[PDB]
Design an enzyme around this catalytic site. Structure first.
Site, PDB file in Angstrom:
ATOM      1  N   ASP A   1       1.234   2.762   3.615  1.00  0.00           N
ATOM      2  CA  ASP A   1       0.456   3.958   3.242  1.00  0.00           C
ATOM      3  C   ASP A   1       1.316   5.210   3.302  1.00  0.00           C
ATOM      4  OD1 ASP A   1      -1.817   5.271   2.205  1.00  0.00           O
ATOM      5  OD2 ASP A   1      -2.687   5.552   4.202  1.00  0.00           O
TER       6      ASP A   1
ATOM      7  N   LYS B   1      -8.872  -0.234  -6.354  1.00  0.00           N
ATOM      8  CA  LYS B   1      -8.991   0.423  -5.059  1.00  0.00           C
ATOM      9  C   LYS B   1     -10.310   1.151  -4.940  1.00  0.00           C
ATOM     10  CE  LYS B   1      -7.472   2.149  -1.069  1.00  0.00           C
ATOM     11  NZ  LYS B   1      -6.311   3.069  -1.162  1.00  0.00           N
TER      12      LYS B   1
ATOM     13  N   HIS C   1      -5.030  -0.437   5.527  1.00  0.00           N
ATOM     14  CA  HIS C   1      -4.661   0.360   6.705  1.00  0.00           C
ATOM     15  C   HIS C   1      -5.692   0.320   7.834  1.00  0.00           C
ATOM     16  CE1 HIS C   1      -7.292   3.112   4.698  1.00  0.00           C
ATOM     17  NE2 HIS C   1      -6.376   3.748   3.991  1.00  0.00           N
TER      18      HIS C   1
ATOM     19  N   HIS D   1       1.676   5.351  -1.830  1.00  0.00           N
ATOM     20  CA  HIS D   1       1.412   6.520  -2.663  1.00  0.00           C
ATOM     21  C   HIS D   1       2.750   7.084  -3.131  1.00  0.00           C
ATOM     22  CE1 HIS D   1      -2.853   6.639  -1.637  1.00  0.00           C
ATOM     23  NE2 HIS D   1      -2.458   6.169  -0.465  1.00  0.00           N
TER      24      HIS D   1
ATOM     25  N   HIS E   1       0.830  -1.207   0.000  1.00  0.00           N
ATOM     26  CA  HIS E   1       0.000   0.000   0.000  1.00  0.00           C
ATOM     27  C   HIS E   1       0.872   1.267   0.000  1.00  0.00           C
ATOM     28  CE1 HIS E   1      -3.970   1.982   1.461  1.00  0.00           C
ATOM     29  NE2 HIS E   1      -3.173   2.955   1.075  1.00  0.00           N
TER      30      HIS E   1
ATOM     31  N   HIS F   1     -10.480   1.180   1.159  1.00  0.00           N
ATOM     32  CA  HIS F   1     -10.352   2.182   2.219  1.00  0.00           C
ATOM     33  C   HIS F   1     -11.685   2.209   2.939  1.00  0.00           C
ATOM     34  CE1 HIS F   1      -9.061   6.186   3.974  1.00  0.00           C
ATOM     35  NE2 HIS F   1     -10.314   6.048   4.354  1.00  0.00           N
TER      36      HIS F   1
END
Ligand SMILES: NC(=O)N[C@@H](CC(=O)O)C(=O)O
Ligand SMILES: O=C1C[C@@H](C(=O)O)NC(=O)N1
Ligand SMILES: [Zn+2]
Ligand SMILES: [Zn+2]
Ligand SMILES: [Zn+2]
Ligand SMILES: [Zn+2]
Lengths: 343, 335
Positions: free
Chosen positions: B239, B99, B166, B15, B13, B128
């Site tokens: 994350d 996602k 998460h 970004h 996970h 999420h």
């Protein structure tokens, strides 16, 4: 546009800081409020009669010409404070009240209280002489969740203290929970509370959803909505031992918008109209004057002001910021259109 | 002195952003992790195979020579997304997963045909898991999601493979622990190392502000016990979510911790504290591959228990980037 005329209010919980910042912020209070309870958490704190006298004068020096404003001084309670020093300040009219911040076993004795048990001589003296105790009612033990700290204080400190010293007059400052609202509602004539505008207008979602908003970050921390609603209900009820205390607590922008933002809202410029907005929304404007101008005096045994001010229900924009000598202050509700302003 | 040798990890996970930010941040991942699940919440989001292909190459362009790193791309689910586009990208080896961000997607009902396709083709769904109604307290949004969206979804699409991303609550920890082989979760270092007190006591700390919001200590403890137990359907997902310093430090700070530089050692400290180092490799390097049906990495790295000081900041073209744990001393370092 609608007008609300009230006896001139007072602010029963205020931070005015010192130096240049004091000079900047005093006018926002002195233009509107007749008196304010000036908190003692300077660096170093106001813990003696001589310091309070000197600080009172610096505050008066900074009041613009023609504002009828009287600062009501406080003593910061510490382990090392002599009860005779506190008594002499009360007797001479210097200290209107004393302020008890959260206990911490590692605090220097010159700067705070290690445990409430340890300052019983000073508290007994305040009870004896009739001096009110102002309490920031949180327990700050590392293992207590920040949102629980007020509730824990009621159980662990407030209730035993009041049972121990049955004549002690206490203001539960800036209450933030249903726990404290109920507790105060159910107390006797020797227990009162103040409530800030932010704790009436907002809850923790406003500080954390969509972004973290350090200008809403203050202690005690904003709580969940059920607590907000309890506070609103309490002031709306007409209950006469809750009164205006802004906890206006200014920090420079760079100290708010940092890696570790300071706690406190600079709400002196917008507090009164914010309270009017809340009482109106609660269909309780008939209790608004008492909250602002009567309840506090009655609890402190001081006269109600005999001049008036007018709020008008006409939209105005709040400043985005207010200049300091260095850096800037961001007021509570900065940039917003507010519903009530002072005429 | 103490040295810990593990199979090279992956980050399930991540970004990476785009543009100059991507250039800056990619190396902190590519130097350590063999693969990463690259999230699709760019502006505009990655919702087509073509955009995913281009993005994958920008990422690869920014990977230093000699790092064997492969970004596993994801599709940003939208109410309107064509199931054929998503399947095509899966079939072309472009999309590894899709996602689901909450409105993002307005309802699971609006995207049923897309979800049913994922179920049929064996594509994992990364969730999420928060409800977003304005009136729901922020600390309750994860637990409320489980009841009102996650459990109904899983009961309707029983073959769908879901990663609860998460997770931050005992609610989610218990849910995942008691789930079947088609449900897994990732956990960040921050949600193991801290609770909401660390973000709010003594000052407000926007570099600890992320979504889902840090919860109370009992939730932190539930997560720590979950990883420490050896439960094999929880795995590493940082994350890592970088924002320039003055977007973090502002009147409305952005959510996300830039934890890529420090995550792996931070996880090591947690497992060590939980007396559970025997499960550390599986969390880092085995459990994810197993859930995703991908081979484990065939190289190894070593962590040493020597205290390293974390940089105070990382230079960007404009502003700086403040890493998670900036200025602090970390207990384990990558040799
Ligand atoms: N989690 C965060 O706090 N931030 C992530 C988004 C996400 O994982 O939801 C980001 O992309 O900035
Ligand atoms: O208790 C306090 C102290 C005050 C200040 O900054 O003085 N700020 C707050 O937010 N509350
Ligand atoms: Zn206080
Ligand atoms: Zn205060
Ligand atoms: Zn997310
Ligand atoms: Zn994410």
């Amino acid at each position: 546009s609608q007008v609300l005329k009230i006896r001139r209010p007072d602010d029963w919980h205020l931070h005015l800081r010192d130096g240049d910042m004091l000079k900047t912020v005093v006018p926002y209070t002195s233009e509107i409020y007749g008196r304010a309870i000036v908190m003692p958490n300077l660096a170093p704190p106001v813990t003696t009669v001589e310091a309070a006298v000197a600080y009172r004068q610096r505050i008066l020096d900074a009041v613009p010409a023609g504002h009828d404003f009287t600062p009501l001084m406080t003593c910061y309670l510490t382990d090392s404070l002599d009860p005779n020093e506190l008594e002499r300040g009360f007797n001479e009219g210097v200290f209107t009240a004393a302020k008890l911040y959260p206990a911490n076993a590692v605090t220097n004795s010159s700067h705070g209280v290690t445990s409430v048990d340890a300052i019983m001589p000073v508290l007994e003296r305040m009870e004896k002489i009739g001096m009110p105790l102002l309490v920031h009612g949180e327990v700050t033990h590392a293992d207590i969740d920040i949102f629980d700290r007020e509730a824990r204080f009621i159980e662990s400190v407030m209730e035993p203290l009041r049972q121990r010293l049955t004549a002690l007059k206490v203001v539960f400052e800036h209450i933030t929970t249903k726990d404290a609202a109920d507790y105060v509602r159910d107390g006797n004539e020797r227990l009162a509370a103040t409530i800030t505008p932010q704790h009436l207008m907002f809850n923790r979602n406003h500080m954390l959803v969509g972004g973290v908003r350090p200008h809403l970050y203050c202690l005690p921390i904003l709580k969940r909505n059920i607590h907000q609603q309890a506070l609103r209900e309490l002031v709306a009820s007409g209950f006469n031992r809750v009164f205006l205390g802004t906890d206006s607590a200014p920090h420079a922008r760079h100290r708010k918008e940092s890696s570790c933002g300071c706690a406190g809202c600079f709400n002196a410029p917008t507090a009164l109209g914010s309270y009017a907005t809340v009482f109106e929304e609660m269909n309780a404007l008939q209790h608004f004057e008492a909250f602002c101008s009567v309840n506090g005096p009655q609890f402190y045994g001081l006269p109600v002001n005999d001049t008036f001010i007018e709020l008008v229900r006409e939209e105005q924009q709040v400043a985005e910021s207010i200049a300091l000598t260095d850096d800037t202050l961001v007021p509570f509700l900065a940039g917003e259109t507010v519903r009530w302003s002072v005429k």
